[PDB]
Amino acid sequence: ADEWNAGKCISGEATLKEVQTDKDLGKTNRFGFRNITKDGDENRVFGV
Amino acid sequence: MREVISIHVGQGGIQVGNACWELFCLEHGIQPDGQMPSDDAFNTFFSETGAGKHVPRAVFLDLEPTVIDEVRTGTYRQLFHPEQLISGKEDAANNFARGHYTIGKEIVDLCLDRIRKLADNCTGLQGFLVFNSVGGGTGSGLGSLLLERLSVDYGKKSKLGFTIYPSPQVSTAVVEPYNSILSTHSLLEHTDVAVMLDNEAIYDICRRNLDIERPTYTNLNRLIAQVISSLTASLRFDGALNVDITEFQTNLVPYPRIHFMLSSYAPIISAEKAYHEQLSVAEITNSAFEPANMMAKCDPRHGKYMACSMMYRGDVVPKDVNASIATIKTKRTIQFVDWCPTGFKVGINYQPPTVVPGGDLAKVMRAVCMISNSTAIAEVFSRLDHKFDLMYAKRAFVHWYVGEGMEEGEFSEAREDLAALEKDYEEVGIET
Numbered sequence: 001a002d003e004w005n006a007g008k009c010i011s012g013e014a015t016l017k018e019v020q021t022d023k024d025l026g027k028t029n030r031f032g033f034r035n036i037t038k039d040g041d042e043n044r045v046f047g048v
Numbered sequence: 049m050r051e052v053i054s055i056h057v058g059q060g061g062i063q064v065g066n067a068c069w070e071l072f073c074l075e076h077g078i079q080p081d082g083q084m085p086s087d088d089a090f091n092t093f094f095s096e097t098g099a100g101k102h103v104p105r106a107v108f109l110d111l112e113p114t115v116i117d118e119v120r121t122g123t124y125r126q127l128f129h130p131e132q133l134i135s136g137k138e139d140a141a142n143n144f145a146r147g148h149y150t151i152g153k154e155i156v157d158l159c160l161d162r163i164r165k166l167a168d169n170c171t172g173l174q175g176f177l178v179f180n181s182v183g184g185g186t187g188s189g190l191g192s193l194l195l196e197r198l199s200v201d202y203g204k205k206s207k208l209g210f211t212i213y214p215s216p217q218v219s220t221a222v223v224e225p226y227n228s229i230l231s232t233h234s235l236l237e238h239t240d241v242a243v244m245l246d247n248e249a250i251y252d253i254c255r256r257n258l259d260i261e262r263p264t265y266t267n268l269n270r271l272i273a274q275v276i277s278s279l280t281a282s283l284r285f286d287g288a289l290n291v292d293i294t295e296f297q298t299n300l301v302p303y304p305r306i307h308f309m310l311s312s313y314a315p316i317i318s319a320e321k322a323y324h325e326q327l328s329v330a331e332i333t334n335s336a337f338e339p340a341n342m343m344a345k346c347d348p349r350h351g352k353y354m355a356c357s358m359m360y361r362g363d364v365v366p367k368d369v370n371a372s373i374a375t376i377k378t379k380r381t382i383q384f385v386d387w388c389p390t391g392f393k394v395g396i397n398y399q400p401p402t403v404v405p406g407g408d409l410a411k412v413m414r415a416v417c418m419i420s421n422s423t424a425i426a427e428v429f430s431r432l433d434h435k436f437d438l439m440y441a442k443r444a445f446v447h448w449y450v451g452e453g454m455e456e457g458e459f460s461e462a463r464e465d466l467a468a469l470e471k472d473y474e475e476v477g478i479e480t
């Protein structure tokens with residue numbers, strides 16, 4: 001005269017933080033490039 | 049009293065359109081179930097069921113069960129009519145022959161009957177709308193076969209097709225050049241207007257103005273869906289200067305052969321940034337002709353222009369529209385063809401674009417969608433033409449095609465027609 005990872009390493013753990021898809025889809029996380037409006041006017045004329 | 053019938057075909061075709069309905073539905077207030085919460089401008093794209101919810105004027109055909117069967121279990125399970133979702137059993141598998149000579153016939157017969165039944169309800173049929181991606185299997189076959197059949201049964205009704213072509217360099221399949229050449233041949237002599245919506249080009253718009261570093265197919269469609277709404281805007285709303293669906297292929301096509309064009313939309317501004325731009329009409333139109341903003345990956349600066357149709361949707365005062373148009377002629381970077389002195393047909397609408405919740409679009413109060421036919425289109429045909437030369441040089445991949453019932457020479461005749469098309473545009477551009 002061999003740990004648990006004996007072929008099943010292909011799956012394990014994967015916290016709910018890792019499960020979330022990537023970072024941002026159809027959405028710019030940049031502070032000035034986001035899409036969420038300010039709390040002052042949740043909906044209103046965005047022009048002139 | 050004027051109606052339009054919408055036809056969707058192909059995995060992309062079903063996917064490309066789906067962005068259209070949720071946008072269209074939210075404009076008039078019809079909930080997902082169809083019950084009206086709380087004048088009759090919605091008849092242009094919907095038909096009453098006599099009592100209760102409404103019924104859209106569309107038919108879904110796609111040979112692969114999965115994509116069509118996706119809608120059968122979503123939140124829209126209470127909107128679409130049950131028996132108008134004709135579904136096949138086996139997919140075209142990217143073979144141009146399977147979807148038009150082998151398996152497409154056994155389901156098209158259903159297609160004609162359904163379309164015929166829908167029209168009988170209407171009385172003011174203006175024209176047809178068909179979505180079919182040349183970059184996909186079923187779209188190429190079912191799209192072509194349907195086009196020929198539809199023309200014979202009905203005839204002089206107007207037809208517009210929102211085909212999506214492969215990008216100049218980025219592509220998904222490996223046989224896209226074939227079905228493009230084969231599909232393009234059929235669509236040239238049967239359609240009144242065809243557009244350019246190459247997928248890659250729309251990518252650039254996303255990454256420049258919106259600045260979305262991780263865009264997917266869900267996001268691409270909405271911008272496409274927006275274009276559909278704008279074109280029909282002056283059809284179901286009050287407007288000072290209206291353009292009829294019949295009066296689109298009346299002022300855009302100069303000659304019988306040339307029936308193509310590429311469009312663009314703007315302005316596209318996000319909420320976090322819209323606080324800095326007034327979005328004045330004098331400026332917004334400027335971005336319209338900006339080469340970057342063209343929806344298609346093509347160079348508008350390599351040739352001359354024939355005609356430009358620009359529909360203005362918003363609150364623009366008529367005076368400004370005329371004021372900005374003249375300045376456009378001044379620019380030396382955009383030159384018109386010799387044989388068209390006056391070439392602007394401007395339409396103005398009143399109802400602003402509506403914002404789909406959770407989307408990228410930020411509510412903007414002046415929007416424009418431009419459809420113009422330019423000599424630069426021949427570039428995409430030329431480049432795609434080069435692709436077909438290399439592969440068939442040693443008849444690579446030809447075996448799969450004659451195996452479904454298509455003749456070997458069918459590819460021989462396909463290239464000649466396009467060759468004529470490529471020559472034709474160069475003939476037009478020559479000044480007298």
Ligand SMILES: Nc1nc2c(ncn2[C@@H]2O[C@H](COP(=O)(O)OP(=O)(O)OP(=O)(O)O)[C@@H](O)[C@H]2O)c(=O)[nH]1
Pocket residue numbers: 057058059060061063064110112139140141142181182183184185186187212213214220221247265266268269
């Ligand atoms: N813009 C956009 N194009 C799509 C999308 N999905 C598919 N396509 C187009 O479809 C083409 C390939 O065909 P598919 O849509 O995948 O499927 P199909 O056309 O029905 O052909 P089959 O797969 O054999 O059924 C690609 O070249 C894409 O251009 C999408 O979500 N957005």
Ligand SMILES: [Mg+2]
Pocket residue numbers: 058059060112115184185186
């Ligand atoms: Mg498909």
